Symmetry: D3
């Protein structure tokens, strides 16, 4: 009973934010064109997903995520549209603390080329609850050419133990 | 990056299945200082959306998560919107946990007069005084709140006390 | 042979509308009641009382109501602040898709302050999507003003 | 007291184009299905818990958002367009759909058509909900791994999801 | 020409009944097994194992099972303390509303003695099923009838 | 004003999909001191309703929120109620977070069952690991398939 050992390792968790760009376009017709002042959108406009691991849980689907993980766990966030950034493109450019404890280290952008991808990576360094704000640019495409629609952010919630 | 974080004002509605209560609690307390416990299964709680605010929409427990600073305003009604049986909140208090919310304040709201005829479909039938219970999140952590309400039944164009009841719900602030 | 005593249920349905969300996302809506503005089910919440053989996705704007053939329903609508500031008032319910599970809805007035409910009975088996139209008023200086006319589409099935 | 005619409330119902994204937890599949099929006409079954499905909102459209089974409810006349990706958006491992077919129930959907979308090349699998009823669909996909930047086929898999139209 | 090798699935379903909630909310229940007292689906949870083309609302007392025509089901019931204290024992399953998706159920005895209620989805459509059970309380190393109850749950086959 | 708040006794049932485990983890630990990790996806956790208690009913992770002072009693079983294959909990211990719960005690209930009981004695959030043995029904005998653990989440206020 005091001889049961449990292998306990740091997890590496992939998170994908899936954004309903059509919905956003419809509900925010005149958004910010300043990336330093992004337009707040509600969490109803997107979906967040993550892979399972021991000690990790979430409200899968919810744009809020409600992630609970272990101190020590690494996270990697990417964003895309419902058509996987094939038409409109939703492209995250920053992740920052919004409320609560500094659970996560400052996020680092990492590029992955081949199509260029970008993930935003951190580690749960402290126990607590934290709300994160993630900013993204939304582009449309017309003559097979991207054009900026606006800059937006949403807030999501995480906790580590 | 400027996010312009500001204190939100969240409206919360508790919708109580009064028929269910009356069937499951046929002999409840008639002393308002000693309300009858009901499960959160007997009601539903809803709240409006805001950045950094989430909940278990529909569940009587709510599971509200919001920002220190956010204001909340709580009202209660029945599944028939207090048109027959009425469920009327008279108190909110801390049940467990940190005092995340300030003690609540009852505020009286007078319903507006009607819109002009040009603005009202004839298809609509439309005096009420309402009460809401306001607070603000002021400390980080987790709190369980007890909300006590009077259940009145409609007898013949007249209300009669059925009983006093309370449920517990859960909230947290960051 | 066991006797369950199945009989018709009477289900109360409450639609709770996030009027502040609507006003923000549909700033120039329809002012024609014969032509309401579509809103997504994310902008409201639907609730119903429990009963034998009735289920739903409680709190979802779509409801996904599953009930018995023979069951009565009574629908009402209000805002998150219980129509005390902004007000959301149902004025019509109609078939949008699917089978004619429900009889045509009929408005009922309920006296003292004045309320209205929209009632029907599930007379056939199958799946039906229903559109509910409502007027949204804002309140300014103890007076109401029309903001716009909207509709949402919800889903129901009877067995 | 403005007259509203209850018999001409017009909702302007139109067919919706629903975009659906399947997000596959490829790391889970590799661990839990270490000996998959390498024959694409005989893909290996995976549980709907291995993946998430998401769809855009529209009137009369609903789903269990996030769930791999979807439980999609839509209008007869609507068009679905399905794409597939991993949790890392196919940047490392990649999950690529190659077929969608009827698995059980009514023929709600016409046979799906693969459509190319260009200016990376992207493919979506599209169909119109042509009849009322309930159908379960099987979607087959290839999972390719990258180890040390070497891309190879890991296996062919399929999951089943559910949809209904009225 | 893709072969899915579709096969009939055998789904295990477990109904877990919150017997304390029931006892406190139904002080005078039916004592006649032919007239069981209806309980709300909020009073229990239903669980099932996963399989291709099988889904449910996992944990909800109504279940919302969607399965394939040809799939078999086996239902068992137990309390939150696995029938070690209060016991919930199913004794019948029957059609409440809807189509005859499932054949009449067969009680099967398993050996320390359990009973399962088995059937097969023989027809496409939507069915509501009523499951009746006996709730017994544990007194002093002794079990006594508290009452007879049923709940209604929902299933569909395609 | 007076709510007569009472300490609650919460029964928790873990229902393990033994067929899923067998398929997913064909070569598990045969050493009970060193159980094999499984995803909370392979099981379901449920608990009784009570004031101040909530959970994500069904999820293998539970996400239980209860009150300091509340007792928990945990039992485990298969989707066939341990009538064929059997899943039998033999240990519960802290995995992560605050020590919200006292050490768990096994209690025998008399055909013979075992429960694992604790009380929430401090406020905070704790992850717990629960270990169990999975046995398969040979004919009318039991054979050991493997030892496993899953991780679930609880919080007290």
């Amino acid at each position: 009973p005091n001889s049961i050992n449990l292998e306990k390792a740091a997890q590496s968790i992939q998170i994908l934010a899936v954004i309903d760009t059509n919905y956003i376009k419809r509900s925010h017709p005149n958004p910010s064109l300043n990336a330093q002042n992004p337009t707040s959108i509600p969490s109803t406009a997107l979906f967040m997903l993550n892979g399972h691991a021991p000690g990790v849980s979430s409200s899968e689907g919810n744009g809020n995520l409600g992630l609970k993980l272990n101190v020590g766990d690494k996270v990697s966030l990417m964003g895309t549209s419902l058509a996987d950034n094939s038409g409109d493109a939703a492209l995250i450019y920053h992740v920052q603390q919004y409320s609560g404890a500094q659970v996560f280290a400052p996020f680092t952008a990492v590029t992955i080329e081949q199509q260029v991808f970008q993930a935003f990576e951190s580690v749960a360094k402290s126990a607590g609850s934290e709300y994160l704000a993630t900013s993204f640019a939304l582009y449309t495409r017309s003559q097979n050419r991207k054009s900026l629609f606006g800059y937006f952010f949403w807030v999501w919630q995480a906790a580590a133990a």
